[PDB]
Design an enzyme around this catalytic site. Sequence first.
Site, PDB file in Angstrom:
ATOM      1  N   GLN C  40      43.972  30.424  18.814  1.00 27.64           N
ATOM      2  CA  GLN C  40      44.953  31.292  19.246  1.00 27.64           C
ATOM      3  C   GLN C  40      44.397  32.502  20.364  1.00 27.64           C
ATOM      4  O   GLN C  40      43.112  33.335  19.544  1.00 27.64           O
ATOM      5  CB  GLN C  40      45.456  31.240  17.891  1.00 27.64           C
ATOM      6  CG  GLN C  40      46.568  30.372  17.234  1.00 27.64           C
ATOM      7  CD  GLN C  40      46.867  30.286  16.113  1.00 27.64           C
ATOM      8  OE1 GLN C  40      46.303  31.231  15.363  1.00 27.64           O
ATOM      9  NE2 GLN C  40      48.345  30.669  16.419  1.00 27.64           N
ATOM     10  N   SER C  41      45.116  32.935  20.715  1.00 25.95           N
ATOM     11  CA  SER C  41      45.251  34.169  21.882  1.00 25.95           C
ATOM     12  C   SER C  41      45.122  35.228  21.246  1.00 25.95           C
ATOM     13  O   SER C  41      44.046  35.996  21.938  1.00 25.95           O
ATOM     14  CB  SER C  41      46.521  34.002  23.429  1.00 25.95           C
ATOM     15  OG  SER C  41      47.457  33.913  22.282  1.00 25.95           O
ATOM     16  N   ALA C  43      44.216  35.757  18.224  1.00 26.97           N
ATOM     17  CA  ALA C  43      43.346  35.184  16.877  1.00 26.97           C
ATOM     18  C   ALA C  43      42.019  36.995  16.682  1.00 26.97           C
ATOM     19  O   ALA C  43      41.660  37.548  15.676  1.00 26.97           O
ATOM     20  CB  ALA C  43      42.455  33.993  17.064  1.00 26.97           C
ATOM     21  N   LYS C  45      39.457  37.115  20.089  1.00 30.43           N
ATOM     22  CA  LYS C  45      38.393  35.992  20.598  1.00 30.43           C
ATOM     23  C   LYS C  45      37.125  37.707  21.380  1.00 30.43           C
ATOM     24  O   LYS C  45      36.191  36.716  21.119  1.00 30.43           O
ATOM     25  CB  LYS C  45      38.622  35.372  21.740  1.00 30.43           C
ATOM     26  CG  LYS C  45      39.606  36.275  23.191  1.00 30.43           C
ATOM     27  CD  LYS C  45      39.273  36.234  24.385  1.00 30.43           C
ATOM     28  CE  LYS C  45      40.357  37.140  24.962  1.00 30.43           C
ATOM     29  NZ  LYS C  45      39.720  38.729  25.910  1.00 30.43           N
ATOM     30  N   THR C  46      37.607  38.318  20.982  1.00 35.03           N
ATOM     31  CA  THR C  46      36.676  39.470  21.184  1.00 35.03           C
ATOM     32  C   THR C  46      35.306  39.731  20.276  1.00 35.03           C
ATOM     33  O   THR C  46      35.084  40.451  20.602  1.00 35.03           O
ATOM     34  CB  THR C  46      37.297  41.087  21.588  1.00 35.03           C
ATOM     35  OG1 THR C  46      38.644  40.721  21.960  1.00 35.03           O
ATOM     36  CG2 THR C  46      37.187  41.753  22.768  1.00 35.03           C
ATOM     37  N   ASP C  66      40.670  36.128  32.685  1.00 34.58           N
ATOM     38  CA  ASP C  66      41.512  37.098  33.519  1.00 34.58           C
ATOM     39  C   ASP C  66      40.339  38.611  34.640  1.00 34.58           C
ATOM     40  O   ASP C  66      41.681  38.775  34.867  1.00 34.58           O
ATOM     41  CB  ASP C  66      42.166  37.352  32.566  1.00 34.58           C
ATOM     42  CG  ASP C  66      43.291  35.821  31.788  1.00 34.58           C
ATOM     43  OD1 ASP C  66      43.505  35.234  31.801  1.00 34.58           O
ATOM     44  OD2 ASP C  66      42.879  35.984  30.398  1.00 34.58           O
TER      45      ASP C  66
END
Lengths: 92, 93, 247, 244
Positions: C40-41, C43, C45-46, C66
């Site tokens: 999920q966005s 969550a 990701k970094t 992006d």
Amino acid sequence: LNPVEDYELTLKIEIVKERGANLLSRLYRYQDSQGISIDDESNPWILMSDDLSDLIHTNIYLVETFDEIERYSGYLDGIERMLEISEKRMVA
Amino acid sequence: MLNPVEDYELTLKIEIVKERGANLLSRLYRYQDSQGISIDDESNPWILMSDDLSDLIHTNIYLVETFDEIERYSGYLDGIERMLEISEKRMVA
Amino acid sequence: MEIQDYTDSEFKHALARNLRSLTRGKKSSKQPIAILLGGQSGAGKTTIHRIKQKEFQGNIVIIDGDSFRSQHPHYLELQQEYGKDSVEYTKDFAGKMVESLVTKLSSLGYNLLIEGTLRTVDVPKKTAQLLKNKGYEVQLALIATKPELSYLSTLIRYEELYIINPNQPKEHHDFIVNHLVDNTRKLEELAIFERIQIYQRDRSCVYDSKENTTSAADVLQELFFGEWSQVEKEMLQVGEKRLNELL
Amino acid sequence: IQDYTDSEFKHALARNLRSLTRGKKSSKQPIAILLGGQSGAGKTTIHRIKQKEFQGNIVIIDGDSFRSQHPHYLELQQEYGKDSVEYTKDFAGKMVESLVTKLSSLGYNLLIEGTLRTVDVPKKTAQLLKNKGYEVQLALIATKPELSYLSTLIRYEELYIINPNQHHDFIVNHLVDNTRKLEELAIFERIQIYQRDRSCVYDSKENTTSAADVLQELFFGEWSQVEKEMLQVGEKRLNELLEK
């Protein structure tokens, strides 16, 4: 802030001023060796010398927190990195 | 070194700081474009900045492990930002 | 002649300077790895960007779709014409830049960390199967955290991004939970990735397919639907507090 | 050797005048402040006070910073490891001369790091400053001589971290003596003494007692709670620099 914190800040302010003055003198060294006129505000090197100059001569003394110092430090860090790459292309 | 709560905080700050840099870069590109500075003109001082900045955004920032290194970074970005402001205004002078 | 219709020269000029930037500081091999992202966005990701950049010691290339939207040759005009909706005019350029950079960089032999589109089964299928074809070890790096804690970070980030640029929700993103579970199991069943790792917000690794024999997807569901830890239970308290701050 | 041509001085001087003028505005009522006090007492404290007190509008002139600006500094460092100072202060001093002169004509606010171990230099300076129409003040910094000697050693262990290829402390008696004499000769409109925590401990405007006397009790007085605290912090940080 207490008396010891406050002085330890004054000390960081000092460390930064010295370190900055060192880099400015190096900037001036680089700028002359390129023929860059002093007020050539269009030149990116003039901008850096001008910004930094405005800090060493005024803004560092106006700093009130240890965070502001880390910011100014990583800014100097940034300068130095660019300055080092330019002198090694030079005495290449 | 750091709490799981603090460790994610650092992740969020790294994410914050990356995004800013990315946008400063784009901005820095747009200016270099208006100045006809060629993509790879490493000789040009402006290219050093965009080289320096993109190196951190793509690599170095993800290797940060202290909060004070986050400040180190954003104070750099500040400087880059100040010079962009002045350069962009100088075009409109 | 549209306000978002970019010239080819304009697109190539960008592709040129990106390919240069992203290469700068990286060596390639005849043994390259590509890791696709899932989760999920909100969550985090970094977290994986951190794990893998350290793990590869600076020699992986993170490709962030992006990042390139702001490279659109009219980005500004689109910003002061559509505010937040410039996105719906900008993905056209931004996506094309990603498809491009993978294509060229995969051929050049660089290690790649790419977002996957695990909301759709087809995209990563096609991506991995084309990366395999160039001597790539393809992987799935999933970031899993409690769905609520994900929606919450998206909701804090949104209110933050509104504060930086007052002209730049979670329904706008996605609610992928069933899709992300189903598709993970589906990509496991098709045995496409060499490795599948599942990471958490504290950079811990809670599943590795080459060392574990449970299902990636089975491990997902425990994390998505299991009981809450205090570390989860706490992030929820910080979020309510941090959100109140931003409003 | 170490010579400098006259176009090099005018060059670095013109640059410095552009430099220091930045973001500062002139005054029909300008103020000049001289700095006294032991080297490692932390004069950098007074900078903080007076920069905030003039809200960014005061030019600081520190002779020492102007050393690297010698047209052949690199050459003089790549020999005189530390004894490059007497070849640089010839240059640095005249840099201060020209800066004080020109800026004092243009009526800026000035903060000057002073050689208070000598009686004359400051006296002859404030004299030429008052003619120009300056309210000229003295700003002294004071702590226990020890802590002062200590910070100088802390500093020197950090000046060795940067470049291996790169004091004025034992002055307590000269400093007190020169203060009483500058006070009696009535050279300064206002005299102020500051302490490390930015406190103003003496102000000649408010106070009536001798500035020199206040110094002595500050040096030779019993140690304050906070001073003894600073003494341990130094023993702390020096030891790390003993192995860093």
